[PDB]
Every structure is written in C-alpha cells, then in structure tokens.
Homo-oligomer: A and B are copies of this chain.
Amino acid sequence: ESTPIQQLLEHFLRQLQRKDPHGFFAFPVTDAIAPGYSMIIKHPMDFGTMKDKIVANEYKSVTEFKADFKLMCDNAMTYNRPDTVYYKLAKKILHAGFKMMSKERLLALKRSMS
C-alpha cells in the first residue's frame, strides 16, 4: 500500500544504508554512549528516523530527504573527532550519497518519469 515517491526514497535510503553495514547511523545516538551529544547536536538525525518519515509520507521532495541525510552526516562529523571511524564513514557516505542523488541524476530520472 505505497506510493511512487515513497518507493524512490526507500531505494535511495537502502542504497545509503548499505554503505553503513555496522549500523553506525541506523538509530539515534544516546548521551549514554556519547556524553554531551544532546547539547552539541541540537538537530539529531539517523537513518531509522528518515525511514519513519518515509513511512509517514513526510517527505514532499528528494531535496528534503537529502537535507536530512546531509544533517546526519554533518552531525557525525561535528561530534566525532576526525580520526574516528564514525567521522570518516560520515565523510565518505555524504559525498557518495550526494553523487548518487546529484542534481544531474535526478534530471535524468525526471526525464525517464516522462
């Protein structure tokens, strides 16, 4: 019982989540594993949250989806120091993810949606 836009975002999310196989970004970060996280990161985001937003039809556009993805990675790269696995993975998948969902590839997709 879905829609085309939800199917497209689920695809993109799935492709992004496969770049993160240990589920570093799969759920919210707690202060219990990350002291100060809720004071340093005031706009938390994670893949599970983006999943629930897809399920609730809360994205009107891929630009909105991308901005949540950007936020998640920017948070990881803000709270974690540059030599941690979390920083480095967030860096790599931000740039990979934005290439996957580039302006140009979405123009191509828009063409194919006729």
- Chain A residues near B (Cβ < 8 Å): 2, 4-5, 7-8, 11-12, 60-63, 66, 105-106, 109-114
How many copies of this chain does the complex contain? 2
In the complex, how many angstroms separate the beta carbon of A41 from the nearest chain B beta carbon?
26
In the complex, how many angstroms separate the beta carbon of A109 from the nearest chain B beta carbon?
5
Instruction: Tell me whether chain A's interface is mostly helix, strand or loop, or mixed.
Output: helix
Check A109–B11 contact: CB distance below 8 A: no
Q: Given A61-B112, A62-B113, are A7 and B7 neighbors across the interface (CB < 8 Å)? A: yes
Whose C-beta in chain B lies nearest to the C-beta of A65?
B114
Check B114–A62 contact: CB distance below 8 A: yes
* Apart from A4-B109, A60-B112, A62-B113: 4 A-B pairs, beta carbons within 8 A: A7-B7, A62-B114, A66-B114, A113-B113
Residue in B2, B8, B60, B61 whose CB lies within 8 Å of A4: B8
Whose C-beta in chain B lies nearest to the C-beta of A62?
B114
